[PDB]
CSV table of C-alpha atoms and ligand atoms in Angstrom, one decimal:
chain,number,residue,atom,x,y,z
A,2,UNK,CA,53.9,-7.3,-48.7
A,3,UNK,CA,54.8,-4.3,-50.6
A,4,UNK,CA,54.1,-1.8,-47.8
A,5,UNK,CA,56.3,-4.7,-45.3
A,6,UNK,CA,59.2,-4.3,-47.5
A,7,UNK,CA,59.9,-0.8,-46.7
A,8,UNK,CA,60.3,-1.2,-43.2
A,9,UNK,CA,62.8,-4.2,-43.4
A,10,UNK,CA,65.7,-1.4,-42.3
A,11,UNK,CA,66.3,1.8,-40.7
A,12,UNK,CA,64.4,4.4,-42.1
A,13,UNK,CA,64.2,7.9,-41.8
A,14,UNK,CA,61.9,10.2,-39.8
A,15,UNK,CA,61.0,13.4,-40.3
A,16,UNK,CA,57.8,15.2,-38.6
A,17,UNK,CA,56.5,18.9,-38.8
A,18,UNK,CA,54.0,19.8,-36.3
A,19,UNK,CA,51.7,23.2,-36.6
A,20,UNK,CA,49.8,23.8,-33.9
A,21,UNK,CA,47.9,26.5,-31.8
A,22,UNK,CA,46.4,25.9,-28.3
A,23,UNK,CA,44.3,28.7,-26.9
A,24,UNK,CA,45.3,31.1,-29.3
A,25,UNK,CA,49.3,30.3,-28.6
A,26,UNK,CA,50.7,29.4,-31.9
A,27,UNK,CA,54.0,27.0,-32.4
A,28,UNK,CA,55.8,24.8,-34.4
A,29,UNK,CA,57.7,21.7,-33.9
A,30,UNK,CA,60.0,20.2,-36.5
A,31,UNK,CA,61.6,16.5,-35.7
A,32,UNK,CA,64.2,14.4,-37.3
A,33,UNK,CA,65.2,10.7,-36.4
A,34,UNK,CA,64.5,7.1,-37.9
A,35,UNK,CA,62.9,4.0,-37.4
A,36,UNK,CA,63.8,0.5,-37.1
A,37,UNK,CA,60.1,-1.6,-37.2
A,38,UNK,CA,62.1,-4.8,-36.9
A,39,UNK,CA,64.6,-4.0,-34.0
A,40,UNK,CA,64.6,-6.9,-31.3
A,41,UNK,CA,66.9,-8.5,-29.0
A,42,UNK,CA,65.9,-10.3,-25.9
A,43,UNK,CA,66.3,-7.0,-23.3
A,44,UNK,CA,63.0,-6.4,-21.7
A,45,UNK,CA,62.2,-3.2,-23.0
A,46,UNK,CA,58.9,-3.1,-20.9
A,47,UNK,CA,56.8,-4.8,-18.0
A,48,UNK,CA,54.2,-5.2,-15.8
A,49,UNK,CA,53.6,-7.4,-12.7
A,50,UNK,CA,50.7,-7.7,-10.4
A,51,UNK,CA,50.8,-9.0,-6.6
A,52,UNK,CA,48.7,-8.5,-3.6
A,53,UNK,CA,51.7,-9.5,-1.6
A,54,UNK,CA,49.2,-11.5,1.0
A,55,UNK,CA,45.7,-11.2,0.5
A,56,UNK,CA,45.1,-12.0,4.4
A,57,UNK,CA,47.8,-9.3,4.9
A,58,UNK,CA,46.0,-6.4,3.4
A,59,UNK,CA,43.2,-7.3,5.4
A,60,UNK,CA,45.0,-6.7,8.7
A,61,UNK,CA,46.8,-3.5,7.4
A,62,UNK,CA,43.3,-2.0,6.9
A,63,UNK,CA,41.6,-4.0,10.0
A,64,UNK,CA,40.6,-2.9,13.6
A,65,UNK,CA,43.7,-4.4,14.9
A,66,UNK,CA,46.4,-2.9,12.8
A,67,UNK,CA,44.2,0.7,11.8
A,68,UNK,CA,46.2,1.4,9.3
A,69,UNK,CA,46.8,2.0,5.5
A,70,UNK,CA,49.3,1.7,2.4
A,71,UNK,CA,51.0,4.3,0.3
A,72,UNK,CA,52.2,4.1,-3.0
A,73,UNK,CA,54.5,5.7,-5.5
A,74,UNK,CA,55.2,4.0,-8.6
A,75,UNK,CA,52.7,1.3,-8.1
A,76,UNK,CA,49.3,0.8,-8.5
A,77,UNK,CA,46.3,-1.2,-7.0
A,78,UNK,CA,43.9,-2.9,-9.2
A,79,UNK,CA,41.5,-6.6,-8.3
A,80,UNK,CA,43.6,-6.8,-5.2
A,81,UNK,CA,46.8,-6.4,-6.3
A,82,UNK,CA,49.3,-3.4,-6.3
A,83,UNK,CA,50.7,-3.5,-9.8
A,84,UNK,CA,54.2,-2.7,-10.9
A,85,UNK,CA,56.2,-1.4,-13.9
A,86,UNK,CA,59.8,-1.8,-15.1
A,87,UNK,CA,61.7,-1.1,-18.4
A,88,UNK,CA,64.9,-3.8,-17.7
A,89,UNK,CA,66.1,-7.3,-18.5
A,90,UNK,CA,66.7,-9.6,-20.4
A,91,UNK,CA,65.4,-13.1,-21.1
A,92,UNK,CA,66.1,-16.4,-23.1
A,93,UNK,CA,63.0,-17.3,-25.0
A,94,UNK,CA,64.0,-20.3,-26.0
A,95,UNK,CA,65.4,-21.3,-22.2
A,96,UNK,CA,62.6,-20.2,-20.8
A,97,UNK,CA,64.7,-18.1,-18.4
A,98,UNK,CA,65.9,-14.5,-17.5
A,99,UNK,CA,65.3,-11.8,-15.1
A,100,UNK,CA,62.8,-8.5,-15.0
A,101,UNK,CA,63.7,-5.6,-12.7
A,102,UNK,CA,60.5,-3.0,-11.7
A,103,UNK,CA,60.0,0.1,-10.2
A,104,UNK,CA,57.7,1.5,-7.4
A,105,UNK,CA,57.3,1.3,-3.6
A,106,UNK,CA,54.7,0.2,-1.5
A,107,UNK,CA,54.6,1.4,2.4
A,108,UNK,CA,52.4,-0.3,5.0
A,109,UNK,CA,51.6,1.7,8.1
A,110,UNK,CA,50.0,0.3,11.1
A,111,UNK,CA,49.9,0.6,14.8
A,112,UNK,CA,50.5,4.1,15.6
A,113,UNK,CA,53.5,3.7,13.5
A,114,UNK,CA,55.1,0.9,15.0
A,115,UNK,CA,54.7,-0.7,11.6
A,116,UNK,CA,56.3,0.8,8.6
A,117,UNK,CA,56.9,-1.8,6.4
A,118,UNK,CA,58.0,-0.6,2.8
A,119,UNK,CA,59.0,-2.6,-0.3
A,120,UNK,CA,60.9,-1.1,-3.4
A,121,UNK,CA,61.7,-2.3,-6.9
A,122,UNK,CA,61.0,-5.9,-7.3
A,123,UNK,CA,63.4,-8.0,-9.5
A,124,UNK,CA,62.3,-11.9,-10.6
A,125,UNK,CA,64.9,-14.2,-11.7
A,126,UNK,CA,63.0,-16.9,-13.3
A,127,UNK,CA,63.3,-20.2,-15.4
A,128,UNK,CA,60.3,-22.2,-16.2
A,129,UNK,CA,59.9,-24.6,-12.9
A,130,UNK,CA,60.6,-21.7,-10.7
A,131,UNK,CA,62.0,-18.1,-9.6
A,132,UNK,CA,63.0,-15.8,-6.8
A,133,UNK,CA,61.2,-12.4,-6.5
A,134,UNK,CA,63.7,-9.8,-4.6
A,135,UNK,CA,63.2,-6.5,-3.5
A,136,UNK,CA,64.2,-3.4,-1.6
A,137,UNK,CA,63.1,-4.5,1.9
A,138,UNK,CA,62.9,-2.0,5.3
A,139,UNK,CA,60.6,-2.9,8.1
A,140,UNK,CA,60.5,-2.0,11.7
A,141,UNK,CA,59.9,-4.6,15.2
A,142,UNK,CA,56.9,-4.1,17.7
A,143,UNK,CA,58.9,-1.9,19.6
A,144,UNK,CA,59.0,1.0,16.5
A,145,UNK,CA,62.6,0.1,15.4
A,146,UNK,CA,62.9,0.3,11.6
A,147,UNK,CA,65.1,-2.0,10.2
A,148,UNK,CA,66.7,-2.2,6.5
A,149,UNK,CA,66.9,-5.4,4.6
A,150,UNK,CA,68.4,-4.1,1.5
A,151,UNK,CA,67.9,-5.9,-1.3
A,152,UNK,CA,66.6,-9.1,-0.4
A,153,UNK,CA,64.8,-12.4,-1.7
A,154,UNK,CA,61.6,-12.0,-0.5
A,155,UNK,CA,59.4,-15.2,-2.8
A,156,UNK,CA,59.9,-18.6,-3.9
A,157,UNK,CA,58.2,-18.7,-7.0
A,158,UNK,CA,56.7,-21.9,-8.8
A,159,UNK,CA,55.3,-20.7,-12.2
A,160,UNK,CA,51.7,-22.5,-13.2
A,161,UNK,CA,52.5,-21.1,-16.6
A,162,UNK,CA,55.5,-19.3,-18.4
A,163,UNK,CA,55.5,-18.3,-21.9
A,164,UNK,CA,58.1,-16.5,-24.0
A,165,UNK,CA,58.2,-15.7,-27.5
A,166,UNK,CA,60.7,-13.8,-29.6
A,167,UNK,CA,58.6,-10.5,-28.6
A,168,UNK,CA,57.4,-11.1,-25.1
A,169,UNK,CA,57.6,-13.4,-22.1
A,170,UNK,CA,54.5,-13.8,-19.4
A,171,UNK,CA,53.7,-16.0,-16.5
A,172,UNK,CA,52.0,-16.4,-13.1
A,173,UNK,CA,53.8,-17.9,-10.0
A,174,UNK,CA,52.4,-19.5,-6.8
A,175,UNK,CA,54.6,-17.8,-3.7
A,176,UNK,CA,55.7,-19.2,-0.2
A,177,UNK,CA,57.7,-16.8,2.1
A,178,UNK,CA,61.8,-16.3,1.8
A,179,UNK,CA,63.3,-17.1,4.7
A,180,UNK,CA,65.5,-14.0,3.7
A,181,UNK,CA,62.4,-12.0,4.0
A,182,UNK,CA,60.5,-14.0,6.9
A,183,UNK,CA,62.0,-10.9,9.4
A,184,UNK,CA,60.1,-8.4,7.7
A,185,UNK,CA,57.2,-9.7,8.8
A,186,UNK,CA,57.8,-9.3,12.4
A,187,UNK,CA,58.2,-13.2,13.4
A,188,UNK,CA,54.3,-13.2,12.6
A,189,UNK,CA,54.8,-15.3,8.9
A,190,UNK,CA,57.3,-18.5,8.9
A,191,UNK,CA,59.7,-19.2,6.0
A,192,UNK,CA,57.9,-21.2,3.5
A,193,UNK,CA,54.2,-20.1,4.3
A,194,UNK,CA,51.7,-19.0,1.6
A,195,UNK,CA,51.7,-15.5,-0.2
A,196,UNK,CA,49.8,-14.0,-3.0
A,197,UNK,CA,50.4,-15.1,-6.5
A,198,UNK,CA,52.2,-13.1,-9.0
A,199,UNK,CA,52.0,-12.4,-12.7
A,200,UNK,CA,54.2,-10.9,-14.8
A,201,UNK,CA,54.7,-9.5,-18.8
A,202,UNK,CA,57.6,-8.3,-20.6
A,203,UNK,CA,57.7,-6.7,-24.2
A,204,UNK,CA,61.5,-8.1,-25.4
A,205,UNK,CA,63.0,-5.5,-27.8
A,206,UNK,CA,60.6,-3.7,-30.3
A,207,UNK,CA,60.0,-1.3,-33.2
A,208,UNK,CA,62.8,1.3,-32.5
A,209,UNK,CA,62.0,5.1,-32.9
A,210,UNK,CA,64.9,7.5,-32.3
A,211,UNK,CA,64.2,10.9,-32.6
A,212,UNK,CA,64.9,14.8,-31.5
A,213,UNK,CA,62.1,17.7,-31.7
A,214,UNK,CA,62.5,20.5,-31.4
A,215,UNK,CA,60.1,24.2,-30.9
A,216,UNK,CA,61.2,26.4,-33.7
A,217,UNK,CA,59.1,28.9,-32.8
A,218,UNK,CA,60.6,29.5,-29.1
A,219,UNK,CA,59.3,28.4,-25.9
A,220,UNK,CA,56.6,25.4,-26.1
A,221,UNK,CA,53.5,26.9,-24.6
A,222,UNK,CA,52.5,23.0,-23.5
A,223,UNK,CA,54.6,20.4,-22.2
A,224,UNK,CA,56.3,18.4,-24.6
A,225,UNK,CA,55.1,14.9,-23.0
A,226,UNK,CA,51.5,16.3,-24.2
A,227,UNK,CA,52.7,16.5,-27.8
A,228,UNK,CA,54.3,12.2,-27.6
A,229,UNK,CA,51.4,10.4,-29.2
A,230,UNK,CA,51.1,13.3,-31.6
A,231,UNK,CA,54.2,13.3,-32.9
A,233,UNK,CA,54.4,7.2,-36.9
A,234,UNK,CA,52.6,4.0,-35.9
A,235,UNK,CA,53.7,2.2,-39.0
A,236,UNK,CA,57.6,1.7,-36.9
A,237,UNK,CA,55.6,-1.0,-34.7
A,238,UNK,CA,56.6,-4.4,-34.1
A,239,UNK,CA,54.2,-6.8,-35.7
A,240,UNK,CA,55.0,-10.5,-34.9
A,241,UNK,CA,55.2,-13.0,-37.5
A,242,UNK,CA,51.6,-14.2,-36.7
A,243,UNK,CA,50.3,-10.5,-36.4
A,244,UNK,CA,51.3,-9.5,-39.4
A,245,UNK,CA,48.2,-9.9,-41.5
A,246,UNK,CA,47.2,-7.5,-38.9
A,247,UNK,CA,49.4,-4.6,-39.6
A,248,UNK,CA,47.0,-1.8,-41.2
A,249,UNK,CA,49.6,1.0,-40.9
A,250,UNK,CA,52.6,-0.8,-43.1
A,251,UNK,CA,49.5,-2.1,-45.8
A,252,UNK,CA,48.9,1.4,-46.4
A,253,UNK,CA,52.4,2.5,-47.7
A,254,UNK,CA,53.9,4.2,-49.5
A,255,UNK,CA,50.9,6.2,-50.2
A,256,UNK,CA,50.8,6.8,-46.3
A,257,UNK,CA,47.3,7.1,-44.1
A,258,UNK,CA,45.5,10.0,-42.7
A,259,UNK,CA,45.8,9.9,-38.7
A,260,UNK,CA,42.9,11.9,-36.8
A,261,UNK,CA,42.9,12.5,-32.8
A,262,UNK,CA,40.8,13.7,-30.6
A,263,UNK,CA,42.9,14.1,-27.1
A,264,UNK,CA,40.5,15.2,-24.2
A,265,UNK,CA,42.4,16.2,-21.0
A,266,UNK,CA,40.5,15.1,-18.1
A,267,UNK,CA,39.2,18.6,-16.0
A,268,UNK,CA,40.5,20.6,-18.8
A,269,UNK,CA,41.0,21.3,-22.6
A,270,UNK,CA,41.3,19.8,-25.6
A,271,UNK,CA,43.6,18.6,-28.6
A,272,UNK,CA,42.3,17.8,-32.3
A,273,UNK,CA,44.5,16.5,-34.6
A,274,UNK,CA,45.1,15.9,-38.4
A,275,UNK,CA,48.1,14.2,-39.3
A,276,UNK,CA,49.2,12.4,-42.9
A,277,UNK,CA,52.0,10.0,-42.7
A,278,UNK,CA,53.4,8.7,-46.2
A,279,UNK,CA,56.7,8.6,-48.0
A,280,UNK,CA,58.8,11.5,-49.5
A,281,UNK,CA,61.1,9.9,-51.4
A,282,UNK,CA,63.2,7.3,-48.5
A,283,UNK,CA,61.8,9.2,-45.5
A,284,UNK,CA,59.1,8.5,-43.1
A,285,UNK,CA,57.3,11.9,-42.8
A,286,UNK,CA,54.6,12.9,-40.1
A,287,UNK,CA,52.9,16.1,-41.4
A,288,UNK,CA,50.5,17.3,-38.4
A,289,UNK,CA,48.2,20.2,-38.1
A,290,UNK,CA,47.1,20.7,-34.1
A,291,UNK,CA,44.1,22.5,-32.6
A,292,UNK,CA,43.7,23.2,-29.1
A,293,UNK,CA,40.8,24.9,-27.0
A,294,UNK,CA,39.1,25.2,-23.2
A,295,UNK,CA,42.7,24.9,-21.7
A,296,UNK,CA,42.7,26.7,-17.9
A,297,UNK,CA,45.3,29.2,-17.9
A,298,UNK,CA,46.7,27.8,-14.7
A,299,UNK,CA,46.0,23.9,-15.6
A,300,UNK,CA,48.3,21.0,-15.6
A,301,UNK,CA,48.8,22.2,-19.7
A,302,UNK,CA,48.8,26.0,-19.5
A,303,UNK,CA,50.6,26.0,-16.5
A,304,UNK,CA,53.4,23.3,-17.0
A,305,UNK,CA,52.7,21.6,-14.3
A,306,UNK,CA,53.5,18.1,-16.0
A,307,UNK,CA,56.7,15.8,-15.1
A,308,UNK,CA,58.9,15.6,-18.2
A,309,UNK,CA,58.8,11.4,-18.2
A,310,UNK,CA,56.2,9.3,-19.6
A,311,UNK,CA,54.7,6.0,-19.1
A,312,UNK,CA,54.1,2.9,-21.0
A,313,UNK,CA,50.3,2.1,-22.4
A,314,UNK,CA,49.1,-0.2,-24.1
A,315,UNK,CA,46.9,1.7,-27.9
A,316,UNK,CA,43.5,-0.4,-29.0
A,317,UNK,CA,43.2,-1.0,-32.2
A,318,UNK,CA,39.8,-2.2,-34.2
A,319,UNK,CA,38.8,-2.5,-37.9
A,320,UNK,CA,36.7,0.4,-39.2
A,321,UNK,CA,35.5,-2.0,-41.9
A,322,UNK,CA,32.9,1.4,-43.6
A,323,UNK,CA,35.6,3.5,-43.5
A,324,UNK,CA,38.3,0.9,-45.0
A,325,UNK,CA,40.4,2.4,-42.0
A,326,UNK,CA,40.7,1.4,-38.2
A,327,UNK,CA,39.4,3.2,-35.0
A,328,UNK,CA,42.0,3.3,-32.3
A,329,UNK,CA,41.5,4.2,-28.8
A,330,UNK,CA,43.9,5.0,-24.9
A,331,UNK,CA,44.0,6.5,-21.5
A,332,UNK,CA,47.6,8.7,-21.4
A,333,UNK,CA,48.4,9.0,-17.7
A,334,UNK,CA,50.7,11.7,-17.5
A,335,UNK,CA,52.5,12.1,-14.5
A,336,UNK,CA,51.7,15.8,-12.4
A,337,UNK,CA,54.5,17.4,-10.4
A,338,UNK,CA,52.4,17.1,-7.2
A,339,UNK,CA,52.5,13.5,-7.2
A,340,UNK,CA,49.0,13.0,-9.3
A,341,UNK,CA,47.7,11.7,-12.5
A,342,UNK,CA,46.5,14.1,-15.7
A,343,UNK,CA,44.7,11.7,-17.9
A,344,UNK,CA,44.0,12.2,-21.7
A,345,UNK,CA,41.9,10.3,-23.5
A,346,UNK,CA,42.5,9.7,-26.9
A,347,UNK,CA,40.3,8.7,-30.1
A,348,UNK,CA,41.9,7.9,-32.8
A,349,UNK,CA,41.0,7.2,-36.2
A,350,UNK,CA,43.5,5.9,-39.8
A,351,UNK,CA,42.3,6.2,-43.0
A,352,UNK,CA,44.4,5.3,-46.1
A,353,UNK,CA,45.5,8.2,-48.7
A,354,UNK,CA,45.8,6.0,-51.8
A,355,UNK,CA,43.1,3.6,-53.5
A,356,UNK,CA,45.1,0.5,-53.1
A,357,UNK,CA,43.9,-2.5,-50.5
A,358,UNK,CA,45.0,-2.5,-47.0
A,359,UNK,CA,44.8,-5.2,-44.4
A,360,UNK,CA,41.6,-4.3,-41.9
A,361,UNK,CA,42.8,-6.1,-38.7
A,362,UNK,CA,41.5,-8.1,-35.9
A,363,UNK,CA,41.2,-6.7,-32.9
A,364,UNK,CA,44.9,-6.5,-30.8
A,365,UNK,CA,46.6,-3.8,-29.7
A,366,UNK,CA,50.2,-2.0,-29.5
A,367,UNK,CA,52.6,-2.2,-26.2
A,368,UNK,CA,54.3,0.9,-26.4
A,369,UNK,CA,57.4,2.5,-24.4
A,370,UNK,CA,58.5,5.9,-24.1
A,371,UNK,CA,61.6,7.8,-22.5
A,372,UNK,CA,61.8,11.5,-22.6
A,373,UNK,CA,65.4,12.8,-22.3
A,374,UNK,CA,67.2,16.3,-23.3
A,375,UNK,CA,70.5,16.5,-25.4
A,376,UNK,CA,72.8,18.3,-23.0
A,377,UNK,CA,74.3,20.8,-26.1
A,378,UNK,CA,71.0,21.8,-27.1
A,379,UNK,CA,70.1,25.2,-26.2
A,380,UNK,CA,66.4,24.9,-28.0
A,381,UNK,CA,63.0,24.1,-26.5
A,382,UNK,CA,63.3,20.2,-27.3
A,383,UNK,CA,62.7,16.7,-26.8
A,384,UNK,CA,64.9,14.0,-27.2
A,385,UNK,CA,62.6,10.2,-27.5
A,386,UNK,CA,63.1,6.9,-27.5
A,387,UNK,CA,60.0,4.5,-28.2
A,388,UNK,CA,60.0,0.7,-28.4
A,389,UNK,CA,56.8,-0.3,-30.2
A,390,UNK,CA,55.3,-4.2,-30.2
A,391,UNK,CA,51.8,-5.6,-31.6
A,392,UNK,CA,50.5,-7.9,-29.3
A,393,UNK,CA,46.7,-9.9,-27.9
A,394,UNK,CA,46.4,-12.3,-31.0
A,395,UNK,CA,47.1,-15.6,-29.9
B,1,HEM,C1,52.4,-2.8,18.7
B,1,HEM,C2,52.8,-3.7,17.9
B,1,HEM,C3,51.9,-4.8,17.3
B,1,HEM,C4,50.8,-5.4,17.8
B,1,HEM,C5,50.2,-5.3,19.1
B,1,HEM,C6,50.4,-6.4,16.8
B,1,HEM,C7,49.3,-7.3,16.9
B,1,HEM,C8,48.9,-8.2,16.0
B,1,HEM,C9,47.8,-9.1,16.1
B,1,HEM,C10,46.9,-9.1,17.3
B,1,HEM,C11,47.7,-9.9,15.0
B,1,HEM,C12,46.7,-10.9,14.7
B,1,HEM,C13,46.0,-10.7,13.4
B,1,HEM,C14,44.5,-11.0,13.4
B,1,HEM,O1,44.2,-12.2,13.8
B,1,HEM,O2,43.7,-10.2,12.9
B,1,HEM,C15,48.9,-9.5,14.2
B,1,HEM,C16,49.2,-10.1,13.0
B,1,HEM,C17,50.3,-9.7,12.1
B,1,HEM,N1,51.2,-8.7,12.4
B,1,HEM,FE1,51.1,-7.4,13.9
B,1,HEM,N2,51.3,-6.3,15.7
B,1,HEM,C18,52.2,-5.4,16.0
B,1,HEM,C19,53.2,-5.0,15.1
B,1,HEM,C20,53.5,-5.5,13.9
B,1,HEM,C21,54.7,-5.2,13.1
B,1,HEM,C22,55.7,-4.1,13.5
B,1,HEM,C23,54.6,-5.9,12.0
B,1,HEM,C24,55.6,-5.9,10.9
B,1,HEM,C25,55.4,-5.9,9.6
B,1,HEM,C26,53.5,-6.8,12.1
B,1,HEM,C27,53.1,-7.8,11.2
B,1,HEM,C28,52.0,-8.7,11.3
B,1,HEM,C29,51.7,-9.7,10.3
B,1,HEM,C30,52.4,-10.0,9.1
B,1,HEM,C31,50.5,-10.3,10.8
B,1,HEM,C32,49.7,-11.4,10.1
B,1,HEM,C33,48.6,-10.8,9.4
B,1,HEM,C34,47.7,-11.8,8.7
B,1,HEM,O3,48.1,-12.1,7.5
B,1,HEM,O4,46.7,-12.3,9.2
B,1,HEM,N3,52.8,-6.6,13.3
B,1,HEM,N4,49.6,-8.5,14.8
B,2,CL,CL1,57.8,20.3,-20.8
């Protein structure tokens, strides 16, 4: 309650960063604020999962077809390729609004006679049922590629749609568009069967809006390496959740944050952070360590996309410790068109003597954009995070 209060507003963010990786010292100095209780109804994040046609994927990958699928953007996981997007908007109280992802899926077949590929899929949705469109081009059995455009591709019937002031989620049965039927190469009618889909969207979410920036020159890592480094107390706890909320209880007195960040195939990050109040600001004090990095790694060598993706940060009550144990997989995107995971362990322990509220298992939906201020001649970053507690019913 008094830990709550001080997040009612905006407040201000400050963060100083010392750190040395393989011997390369640097410092990193940020300014910015935070708004824990920003939310509209815009669809800040999402994620949907589809197997398009279970029967499908079978004949792509059969002895008739002898072919295969390629990806980028989405990914495949219990049959399903599984999508991500960052816009919409929707009505919670309707029950009704729209979600636009990103990714492509190609499906090659017959010597390359079939080249089927489908690109961001959009749902327009209201309770009884939906449409799910998409970026269509296909080709006939004689080779010739068509393109579709953007075209409605699924009549959806959700089993179950939910939406809160935070978040909206449901699962659709599917029958065949007759807008999309001509994809399919006169094979499936209009109205037959397709894979279910299931969707979630985070709506608005604790606000962080800040600028780093290396005052020590060049950074010697990539600044999307430095992200989850660099004030987990601007997260959105729902009114239910809010019991929950470890990292507000804590205040102003602030919390000790502890990382270890191992970088799959190469080195690694420890970290010692204390986050409390000076005066009205927010500060993030943080002393980094880094060792084993390859010289020509995805680290050492910058070979790391400047974007970053949207994960989803375990939390659990460390009850001995009057603190919580918090763990993640980072999946940072590589310039060849790979994956350079870091996992994370994570530990919060409170700086003052006071009580703080030891939570329930649940865990924070968090979204990240990495952009650069266009008058800036510094080494910098410029992020925007949207931050929701979330997996207490
Ligand atoms: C040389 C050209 C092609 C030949 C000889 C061919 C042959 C076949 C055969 C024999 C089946 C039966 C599936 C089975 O029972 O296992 C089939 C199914 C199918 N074909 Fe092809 N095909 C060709 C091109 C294409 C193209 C260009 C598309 C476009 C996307 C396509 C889409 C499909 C679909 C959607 C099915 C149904 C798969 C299922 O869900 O069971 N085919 N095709
Ligand atoms: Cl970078």
């Amino acid at each position: 309650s008094k830990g709550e209060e001080l997040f009612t507003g905006v407040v201000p963010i400050l963060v100083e960063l010392d750190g040395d990786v393989n011997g390369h010292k640097f410092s990193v100095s940020g300014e910015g604020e935070g708004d824990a209780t920003y939310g509209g109804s815009g669809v800040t994040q999402a994620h949907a999962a589809w197997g398009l046609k279970k029967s499908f994927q079978s004949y792509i990958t059969g002895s008739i077809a002898k072919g295969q699928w390629n990806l980028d953007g989405v990914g495949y996981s219990n049959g399903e390729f599984t999508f991500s997007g960052a816009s919409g908007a929707v009505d919670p109280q309707a029950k009704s609004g729209f979600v636009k992802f990103g990714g492509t899926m190609r499906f090659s077949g017959h010597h390359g006679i079939l080249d089927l590929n489908i690109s961001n899929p959009e749902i327009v949705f209201n309770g009884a049922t939906g449409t799910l469109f998409a970026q269509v081009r296909s080709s006939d059995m004689e080779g010739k590629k068509s393109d579709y455009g953007r075209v409605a591709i699924g009549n959806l019937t959700f089993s179950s749609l939910n939406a809160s002031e935070t978040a909206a989620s449901g699962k659709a049965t599917m029958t065949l568009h007759p807008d999309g039927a001509g994809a399919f190469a006169g094979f499936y009618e209009a109205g037959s069967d397709l894979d279910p889909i299931t969707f979630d969207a985070q709506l608005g979410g604790g606000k962080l809006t800040l600028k780093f920036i290396c005052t020590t020159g060049k950074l010697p890592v990539p600044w999307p390496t430095l992200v989850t480094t660099l004030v987990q107390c601007f997260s959105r706890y729902p009114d239910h959740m809010k019991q929950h909320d470890f990292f507000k209880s804590a205040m102003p007195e602030g919390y000790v944050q502890e990382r270890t960040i191992f970088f799959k195939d190469d080195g690694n990050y420890k970290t010692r952070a204390e986050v409390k109040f000076e005066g009205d600001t927010l500060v993030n004090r943080i002393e980094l360590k880094g060792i084993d990095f390859k010289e020509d790694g995805n680290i050492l060598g910058h070979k790391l996309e400047y974007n970053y993706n949207s994960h989803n940060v375990y939390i659990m009550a460390d009850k001995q410790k009057n603190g919580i144990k918090v763990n993640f997989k980072i999946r940072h995107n590589i310039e060849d068109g790979s994956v350079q995971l870091a996992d994370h362990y994570q530990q919060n322990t409170p700086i003052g003597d006071g009580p703080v509220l030891l939570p329930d298992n649940h865990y924070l939906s968090t979204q990240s954009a990495l952009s650069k201020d266009p008058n800036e001649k510094r080494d910098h970053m410029v992020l925007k995070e949207f931050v929701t507690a979330a997996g207490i019913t």
